């Protein structure tokens, strides 16, 4: 009925790093007020606040998507660069706030550099050029005597950033995106942008905007297969219901399953090995404005944990995903001018993060399932998903072979469940279970009770053969030395 | 490494019987020579070559596809109807002969009825028109006073045929076909053949054509996709390296999920649920004329028997499939003039459709696995395929429940396979397991050696754990209780 | 058209009916003669051609020789019936109707 059977020596595949990826748009409070806040006794000397660098770096952010998102689609780089003092104030559209520019590409690669996250970079195909991104990567990249690799030196910085990932537009599909393009014109641009800068740097890995409309894919696939290294794709899910917020872990993967065989019907993206980036998912349902401070519960905590045990076990097909976002906006932390509150989201990579293997091992699920159709969304739009899990697991070891990490997510909304789990070849010992729990499925971290939901850790132990007690709507990771 | 679990108890799914369907083209010997032959001493009255109607009614058809193929984007079935020698000569485009029409729709429904199969009817867009379409159908299913009704049984059938199945078009996509189309063309005409059939008979299911072409499968689904009851896909493949032939059923599990995903990504078809019809499969590599007398060995046989098993396995996605063709075209079948071969590929039916259950329970396969690299088909296209099991297994329920079939391929062409098999709650029992194999990988049937890959079976008995030896190169049905 | 014991039974796809064609051209043309009315003859555009509409106009208009004008006269018309208005098409633009444009 229930029962996970893991095997240590049996390694199905690597697990991609950056299935943990972030992302900060200068949207609401994520970049001011969020990440970075001049004068403030909670910020260091560089304007970071300090409180937010101590939970970012919790969780290893293995690369940082910036600065958009819909704000890029309007962004000119130079407005960022130089001397703050002097950087002009800017009308955002994305998001209708006057941008100061004070946080540009230098604090963000600083930012990155302190978290110790690659820089994953979006170029504005709206109102940008090909000639202001190539800038944009010869200022980041470039080693020679060219102007803008010049300035960088200028500005205080002899050392190139080797920004690896560049984003090549962000949701140029959507009437709402500054510029829009048609399904041909965006195609042609992706291939046309991706082309001349791989000629400036040929290392760069370049992300194509992806959607749900399959003749998109297709045609930037078709056109732009031969350049791009990923197609992204962008996930929002839930409603207030409990089952259809944390069923849309299985609409994802359905998802995810359709931009893979769509990469594998054209012939240059499947031989050039095109993968998917998710690189912005999220819960977002409730608020509907320009600050987005969706307060995420444990329900939406759940979705999440459930979404990084299916990165871990389909990143060969996702190497790349990005939260969307890290502060404030969409926010996994969320900041005020005296402190900040760890959501429940959060606890979710604090959880993963920390507990996970770098392969992943083969591990045998059995779970009753369930159907459900619901609402999804902002707009509550309708979805179904056939035979969800109520139990999911994945396991992973370290790259050494020293530890065995079991994530299990426990999706029954009322009941414990007693699962049986084989580890074949595990002698008798002690292991330490993590656990991602809260008192019912609404629970929330607030200012006065930061720890409502929070990560305990137990001892146990296993053997061969072993039972522990999975709390409803819960994720755990059973730690194990071998 | 090796391993099989089943329990009986827990049914996974139904089993569409149509997974088992066949497909006759006016193509070379397939009709003329072939299930037809006026003046043979070894056809009935009626032509139907006897030989032939009794090793076709061993394999319990379900469905049988006609015309065609090629021939039918040219093909005008009023030409093939009424008294015979009033019928004209009509030159075949698609394969270059002269077409007597004396096999018609009256006598292949009555082939249909003999065999006991359902008629599957492909219309011509190549030349013909929505008028010409809606005649054909209202001539086999018009049970009213209107004139093609009335010609059914003037010609000596007053019941309707009640035809359920209708191929809107055949591979409209390629160069080849007469009156070939642009996937816009093609996806317009599509929903206004099929809406206006189903004005006339909404009872029918109408297979609209697919391809390789991500965008002709979505131009098809998107325009009608609220009409249509399929979409269909044709897969040959083969070449002379056994497991770049066998590897390929695995290739074809691909292709089917991505149409899939296909139709999942447009609404109306995802929400009307709108299958695929794998209406043409086969091996084809080795010859390219007007005939195709493809001369299938074991390594073939053993092909069509992991297609059988996965579509028993994904029958839920892929509820029709025809295999390309019946008789000497691409033949299960080959006949000469005094007599058949029954070569390996009809082998495959002849094990997997008569031990099989309707219902598919649940199967567990521990298998290990190889990557390959290929050629496949007449042009030798390059594929590969990755993690293919060296060991595959469907077990199926009769549909009272007092039959458990274990299909099994053995793949491994080296070595035969001792594979441990669990039953859940499975008393001690005596059970026959039908065997399908050869000499060798290359081994093939003929008129004076017709039974050198065969189907022979052993009693072994058997428990709720047992082991059992599976050769390589081969296909069982452990059949118990 | 013609004697009507030999006119053809139709399924008319439009209202799902069996037509059995005992009122056509010539009824018509007999009908409108009778209340004073002009002919205001719709042409198929869907399942027709332009052949048929040719054809058609031929048999009600054709002063000639021509083999419509001579099937007017041998069904019992000698005159022409001069139908003044053609209806170029119905509803083309619907996709409800047979042969949408
Ligand atoms: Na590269």
Redesign the pocket.
Do not use: N, S
């Given at each position: 009925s229930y029962g996970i059977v893991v095997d240590p020596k049996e390694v199905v595949k690597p697990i991609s790093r950056h299935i943990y990826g972030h992302f900060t748009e200068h949207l609401g409070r994520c970049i001011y007020g969020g990440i970075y806040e001049e004068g403030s006794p909670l910020s260091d000397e560089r304007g970071f606040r300090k409180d937010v660098l101590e939970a970012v770096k919790r969780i290893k952010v293995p690369n940082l998507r910036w600065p958009g998102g819909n704000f890029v689609s309007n962004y000119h780089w130079e407005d960022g660069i130089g001397p703050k003092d002097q950087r002009p104030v800017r009308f955002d559209l994305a998001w209708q706030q006057e941008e100061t520019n004070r946080f540009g590409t230098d604090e963000f690669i600083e930012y990155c550099r302190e978290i110790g996250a690659e820089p994953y970079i979006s170029i504005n195909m709206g109102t940008g050029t090909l000639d202001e991104a190539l800038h944009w990567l010869e200022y980041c990249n470039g080693k020679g005597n060219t102007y803008y690799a010049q300035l960088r030196r200028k500005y205080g910085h002899p050392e190139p950033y080797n920004v690896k990932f560049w984003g090549i537009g962000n949701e140029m599909y959507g009437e709402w995106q500054v510029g829009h393009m048609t399904a041909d014109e965006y195609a042609r641009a992706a291939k046309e942008y991706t082309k001349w800068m791989?000629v400036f740097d040929?290392?760069?890995?370049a992300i194509a905007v992806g959607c749900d409309d399959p003749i998109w894919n297709l045609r930037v696939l078709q056109e732009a297969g031969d350049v791009i290294?990923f197609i992204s794709y962008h996930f929002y899910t839930g409603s207030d219901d409990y089952y259809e917020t944390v069923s849309t872990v299985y609409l994802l993967k359905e998802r995810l399953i359709g931009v893979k065989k769509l990469i594998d019907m054209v012939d240059t993206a499947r031989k050039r090995g095109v993968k998917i980036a998710l690189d912005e998912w999220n819960v977002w349902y409730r608020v509907s404005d320009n600050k987005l401070e969706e307060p995420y519960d444990l329900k939406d905590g759940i979705f999440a944990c459930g979404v990084l045990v299916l990165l871990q076990k389909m990143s060969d097909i996702v190497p790349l995903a990005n939260l969307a976002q890290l502060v404030n906006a969409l926010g996994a932390i969320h900041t005020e001018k005296d402190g900040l509150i760890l959501t429940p989201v959060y606890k979710a990579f604090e959880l993963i993060v920390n507990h996970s293997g770098e392969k992943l091992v083969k591990t045998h699920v059995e779970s009753e399932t369930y159907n459900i159709e619901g609402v999804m969304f902002i707009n509550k739009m309708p979805f179904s998903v056939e035979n969800a899990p109520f139990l999911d697991a994945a396991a992973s070891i370290s790259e050494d072979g020293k530890k065995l990490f079991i994530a299990v997510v426990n999706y029954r909304k009322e009941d414990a469940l007693k699962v049986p789990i084989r580890v074949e070849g595990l002698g008798q010992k002690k292991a330490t279970v993590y656990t991602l729990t809260g008192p019912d499925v609404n629970a929330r971290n607030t200012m006065e009770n930061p720890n409502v939901v929070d990560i305990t850790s137990e001892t146990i132990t296993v053997d061969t053969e072993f039972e522990h007690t999975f709390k409803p709507f819960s994720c755990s990771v059973i730690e194990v030395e071998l």
């Open positions: 791989k040929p290392t760069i890995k290294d």
